[PDB]
Each structure stands twice: as structure tokens, then as C-alpha cells.
């Protein structure tokens, strides 16, 4: 009767429908994946991670059986398993599965894709947690360049990688480079107002700039940032 049980019933039917559809027409694998992602999300929320894993493995087996191999699809499926492992707290496995995704893309054309830049960002973050700074920096830079070439410099995804690098540099106490990164993120994030970016990301940038300026000994600019973040978080109550 619970709200979550209702969401699960709905998501299960929708998955079962996509399964049957892919029985009648084995090519429709992409849509099965999408429906699975919603149900897998819900299973994670209730803590059934093995069920979520089974769903993605099923998606993967269907993708693997295609007569025309779709590496982009496989890349995406592996990245969903990687993210599942990450939320599960299986940090090594998350890195392993993002790496598998990247290897499939590297062997086919897909080096400079949307998925690949995302994966490299997410993988870089796991490497930060593994305390492998150099590997984290490398992947973040690659994600950054790819998003630069795909979207303008003026995009949410570019600013997100800037932000993530900022936190990386800040956490290894490279204050100078942290500053550059967060300012570049600030510059972009100001120029992008609509539903293409929520204002809570803008507040994080000020928050992060605050800690960077404070670490730099500029306590003035630090408080100015912490202030503007507070103004933003307040202004989203209306």
C-alpha cells in the first residue's frame, strides 16, 4: 500500500512490457535498458542491490546477443552497473566497471562521446576516493576537454568538471589550481540561468570558492562567497 511499493509495481509492469516487446522484437534493447534503470533505482532505494544488479546484467546479456554489436549501448550498461556498485559502497568494483565501459568505447569509435566524458568524470571521482590523485586528475582533464569539444565552454557539464577538479585540487591542498577551477566554474555558471542549471549548483560553487579563498588567506572574499551562497539557498524558498 506504501508509496514505494506502488512505484515498484508500476516500474515492474513497465519493465515486463519492455521485456515482452524485446521477446517479439529482439532489437528493442535500448528501451528495455531505460525501463530497467527506473526499476533498478527503486530497488536500490529499498536496499535490494542484488535485484538491481540482476536487472542490469539482464540488460547486458540482451545487448551482448545483438547480431549487430552496439558498443555504445554496452558502454552505457557497464556505466549503470558501475554507478550501482558505487552507491552500494563497492568502490573497487565501480572503478572496474567504468574502466570496462571505457575499454569498449576505446576499441570502437567512441573515444570522444557524451557517455565517455561522463564515465571519465565519474571514474575520476572514484579514484579521488581511492586516494589516487594523479589518475583522478588525468581522467577529469580528459572529461573536461571532451565536454569542451562537445558542448561550448559555456555549458553545465564543463562547469561541473571544473567544479570536480576544483574539489580534487582543494582536497590535495593545491589551493592555486583549486581557485582557477572554481572561478572558471563560477564564470560559466553565472551565464546559465534557466532549467539548464538549477541554482543549488551555483551555491556549491560559492561554498567551494569560500573554502578555497579561506585556505588562500583571503578571508574577506571567503566570507563574501559564503554570504552569496546563503543568499541563494535562502532565495529558493520564495
Amino acid at each position: 500500500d506504501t508509496a514505494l511499493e506502488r512505484q515498484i509495481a508500476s516500474a515492474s509492469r513497465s519493465v515486463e512490457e519492455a521485456r515482452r516487446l524485446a521477446y517479439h522484437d529482439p532489437i528493442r534493447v535500448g528501451a528495455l535498458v531505460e525501463q530497467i534503470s527506473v526499476l533498478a533505482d527503486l530497488r536500490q532505494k529499498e536496499g535490494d542491490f542484488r535485484k538491481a544488479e540482476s536487472l542490469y546484467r539482464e540488460a547486458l546479456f540482451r545487448a551482448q546477443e545483438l547480431r549487430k554489436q552496439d558498443p555504445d549501448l554496452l558502454t552505457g550498461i557497464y556505466s549503470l552497473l558501475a554507478h550501482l556498485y558505487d552507491r552500494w559502497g563497492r568502490m573497487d568494483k565501480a572503478a572496474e566497471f567504468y574502466e570496462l565501459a571505457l575499454k569498449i568505447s576505446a576499441e570502437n569509435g567512441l573515444e570522444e562521446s557524451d557517455k565517455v566524458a561522463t564515465i571519465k568524470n565519474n571514474l575520476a571521482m572514484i579514484f579521488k576516493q581511492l586516494r589516487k590523485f594523479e589518475r583522478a586528475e588525468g581522467y577529469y582533464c580528459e572529461a573536461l576537454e571532451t565536454f569542451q569539444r562537445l558542448d561550448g565552454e559555456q555549458s553545465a557539464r564543463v562547469a561541473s568538471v571544473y567544479n570536480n577538479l576544483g574539489v580534487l585540487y582543494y582536497s590535495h591542498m593545491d589551493v592555486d589550481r583549486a581557485q582557477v577551477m572554481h572561478e572558471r566554474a563560477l564564470a560559466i555558471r553565472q551565464n546559465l540561468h534557466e532549467g539548464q542549471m538549477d541554482p543549488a549548483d551555483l551555491s556549491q560553487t560559492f561554498i567551494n570558492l569560500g573554502a578555497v579563498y579561506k585556505a588562500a588567506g583571503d578571508f574577506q572574499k571567503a566570507e563574501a562567497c559564503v554570504d552569496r551562497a546563503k543568499r541563494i539557498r535562502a532565495a529558493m524558498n520564495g
Binding site: 515492474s12 515486463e16 515482452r20 521477446y23 535485484k51 540482476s54
Partner: protein
């Protein structure tokens, strides 16, 4: 009390063509799935009329279901309750368990899980296969692991078909039993071992026609149904699936049951059905008899069988039987009834018999394993597909323990 069913392997899916054409007859449904009794056990109520069965038709070599879902039975099974994948678990356990098993096992479990989250009283698994091939015994060994790891408090009944003692029918077949009979012994709560040598003979005496594996499976498909027809056609002495483990499995290893059917609309006066049920030639395995005493027999008498007769019939039968020394004088035989016979019959009988003779099936499959494993005689097909000799000798050391566990149970 709604039993899921799994039909892995060509041997199991060919029983599924026999079983779900007998489950539709006993519940009185047409072949399409609609209504022409507890129908909730085998069948998921999708709509008001149509009853989709709780079966996965899990299979490699997808031509078996092409017989099923091509001719007359495509409307019955749900196609999100299936798996069809080439290659075909190449009569090779390591293909079925490891190579082409890990490709499908995420799809198998998430189709089981989409069939047991529609339940509302899940109790059992009538998982139907053989221990002979590579799909029924390889992927059948893999499902038993993953299903017990997912449902450790639910009874998993394996309805195996043993390799024939007569000849092989597959070259690497005594390897594929011991690699499977390990995982049945480790995971399944009770297995029914059936034998195509006995299924040939008893069907040869049944029909005035030389049998085929459709006619052999109707002996199995009644036994698959009669085990779980005191669960869905209640009657008196309601025997669920939880009572085939507590009553018939004394020690934690001795859970390999030898099931007969009788009579083999056919009526039988029933002082002779109990003599037909516990005929030594009507048991569906080549179990030992001159060096074999039972442990725990069962008797599920369905249809127009009234319970007064077993005080005179079955007490006479149990004196004729040979039990272990540690079983009581008139005890040792559980009973049950159903209030509805199978369609075509008017009074049936079943007998799950846990017996030391089934170790002679095990001793055959070890004496075949003894020569064949030490001389590497088909071993490299496992080694070059994931499964080493360490993993395979360890499979022997449990079955050599299991063949001793009945000899310790005499």
C-alpha cells in the same frame, strides 16, 4: 502456496510440453491459457479468463521451445517467462554453468524474480531437468545455486532425469551428473531422480506402442503433478511441499527420491493399486533391491481413494517392503490424498521413496566417473571452459560421500 516452475534443458523443456499439457488438463483449462481446484499454484492469474503458468522455459539450443511456441502452445506461455540463446550449452557442464550460463543467469533470475514478486504465497520450485546434458545439468546446476542464494528458506524440488544405466546417450554424461548432483545435494531440498531405462520399460508395459520421449514424459508429468496435487487439490491429509523434506529426508544428504505412478477413464479397485504403486518394477529408477532397504516411503493417492482402505492395503504393503532397522514396525510411510484424480484417470497413486537403492545410481555414476576422470577422458572440455579438475574431483568427493551416506543409512 503457489509453486514456481523452472524447465531448464532440452530434457526439462520437453517435460514442460508434457507437464503444462497435463497441468492444463487437471485444472481443466484449454491450451491457450483460458478457462475451459486451486488454480493459483501453477498459474498466474493475469486476467479474468486467461491463466499464464508460473514456468520459466529457460533453454539453450532454442529449437525445443520453437516446437512448443510454434505449433499449439504459443499463446499459453508468457514470452517474458523464457530464455532462448544460442549456442546451446554444448552437452558440457562448463558451457551450461560458466560459459553460456553466466550469459543467461541474470536473465533467468530476473524472470524468476518477476514471477515470484507476483506471489502472494510462494512455496516451492518444481525445477525440471536432467542431470545428463549440458543445459539441464549445467545451467540446472547454476540455477540451483542462484535460487538458493536468493531464496534460502523455500523448498527447491529438482525433478531430474538420470543418465541411463543401459547405455550412455551422451559421452561426457557421467561427468555432467556428478557436477550437478553436487549442486542438487548442496541446494535442493529434495530431488526426484527419474531414469529413462525405467521410463522406457514402464511406458512399454503401459502403451501397446513403442514409446518416445513425449510418451515417457507423461509418466514424469504425472509424477511432477502428483507430488504437488495434494497442494492444489486439497482433499484430506494435506501434504504440502514442506512435508516432502521433513518426512522423506531423514539425514541431511538423503534427499534423492524414487517416484512411481499407478495405475500403469482408468479405474482401479485399489487393493491392487497399492501393489502397483509399490511394485519394484513400477519405481522409476534402476535402484538396487537385493541390497536395498528403504528409508522413508510416501504414498499420495489421488482421486476416488478413500482412507479406510490404506489401513488394510498400505499396512499390508509396508510389511512387504524392506525398511531400515531404525524405522518403526508399521511406521515409516507417510500418506496423502487429493480430492481430484488426473484427467484420464479416476484413482491415481504416487510414491516418493527414499531408498538406499538410489545410491546404486550414485555408485554407477561414480564408477563411471572413476575411470573417466583419472584418465582425463573428456576433462579438457571443462578445463578449457572454466572448470578445473580440482572443482570436479571435489564434486566426486561429495557424491562418494553421498553414495556412502545411504550405505551408512542401512
Amino acid at each position: 502456496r503457489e509453486i514456481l516452475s523452472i524447465h531448464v534443458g532440452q530434457c526439462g523443456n520437453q517435460i514442460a510440453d508434457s507437464f503444462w499439457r497435463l497441468a492444463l488438463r487437471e485444472h481443466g483449462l484449454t491450451e491457450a491459457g483460458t478457462l475451459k481446484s486451486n488454480m493459483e499454484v501453477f498459474f498466474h492469474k493475469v486476467r479474468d479468463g486467461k491463466y499464464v503458468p508460473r514456468a520459466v522455459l529457460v533453454d539453450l539450443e532454442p529449437g525445443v521451445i520453437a516446437r512448443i511456441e510454434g505449433g499449439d502452445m504459443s499463446q499459453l506461455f508468457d514470452e517474458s517467462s523464457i530464455v532462448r540463446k544460442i549456442p546451446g550449452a554444448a552437452n558440457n557442464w562448463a558451457r551450461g554453468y560458466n560459459v553460456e550460463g553466466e550469459k543467461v543467469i541474470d536473465q533467468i533470475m530476473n524472470v524468476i524474480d518477476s514471477a515470484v514478486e507476483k506471489t502472494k504465497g510462494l512455496q516451492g520450485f518444481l525445477m525440471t531437468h536432467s542431470i545428463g546434458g549440458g543445459s539441464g545439468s549445467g545451467l540446472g546446476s547454476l540455477i540451483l545455486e542462484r535460487l538458493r542464494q536468493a531464496y534460502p528458506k523455500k523448498r527447491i524440488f529438482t525433478f531430474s532425469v538420470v543418465p541411463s544405466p543401459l547405455i550412455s546417450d551422451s559421452a561426457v554424461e557421467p561427468y555432467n551428473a556428478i557436477l550437478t548432483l553436487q549442486r542438487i545435494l548442496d541446494n535442493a531440498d529434495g530431488a526426484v531422480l527419474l531414469d529413462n531405462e525405467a521410463l522406457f520399460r514402464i511406458a512399454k508395459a503401459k502403451l501397446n506402442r513403442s514409446p518416445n520421449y513425449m510418451d515417457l514424459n507423461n509418466i514424469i508429468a504425472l509424477i511432477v503433478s502428483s507430488v504437488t496435487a495434494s497442494l492444489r487439490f486439497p482433499g484430506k491429509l494435506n501434504t504440502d511441499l514442506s512435508e516432502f523434506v521433513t518426512n522423506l529426508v531423514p539425514f541431511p544428504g538423503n534427499h534423492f527420491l524414487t517416484a512411481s505412478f499407478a495405475p500403469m477413464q482408468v479405474r482401479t479397485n485399489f487393493p491392487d493399486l497399492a501393489r502397483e504403486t509399490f511394485a519394484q518394477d513400477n519405481f522409476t529408477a534402476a535402484i538396487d533391491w537385493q541390497q536395498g532397504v528403504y528409508l522413508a516411503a510416501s504414498a499420495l493417492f489421488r482421486g476416488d481413494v478413500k482412507a479406510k482402505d490404506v489401513d488394510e492395503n498400505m499396512a499390508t504393503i509396508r510389511k512387504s517392503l524392506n525398511y531400515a532397522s531404525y524405522m518403526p514396525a508399521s511406521g515409516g510411510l507417510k500418506l496423502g490424498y487429493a480430492e481430484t484424480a488426473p484427467e484420464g484417470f479416476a484413482s491415481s497413486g504416487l510414491a516418493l521413496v527414499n531408498h538406499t537403492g538410489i545410491a546404486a545410481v550414485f555408485e554407477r555414476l561414480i564408477a563411471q566417473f572413476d575411470i573417466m576422470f583419472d584418465n582425463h577422458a573428456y576433462t579438457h572440455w571443462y578445463e578449457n571452459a572454466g572448470v578445473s579438475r580440482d572443482m570436479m574431483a571435489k564434486a566426486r568427493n561429495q557424491i562418494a560421500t553421498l553414495a556412502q551416506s545411504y550405505r551408512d543409512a542401512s
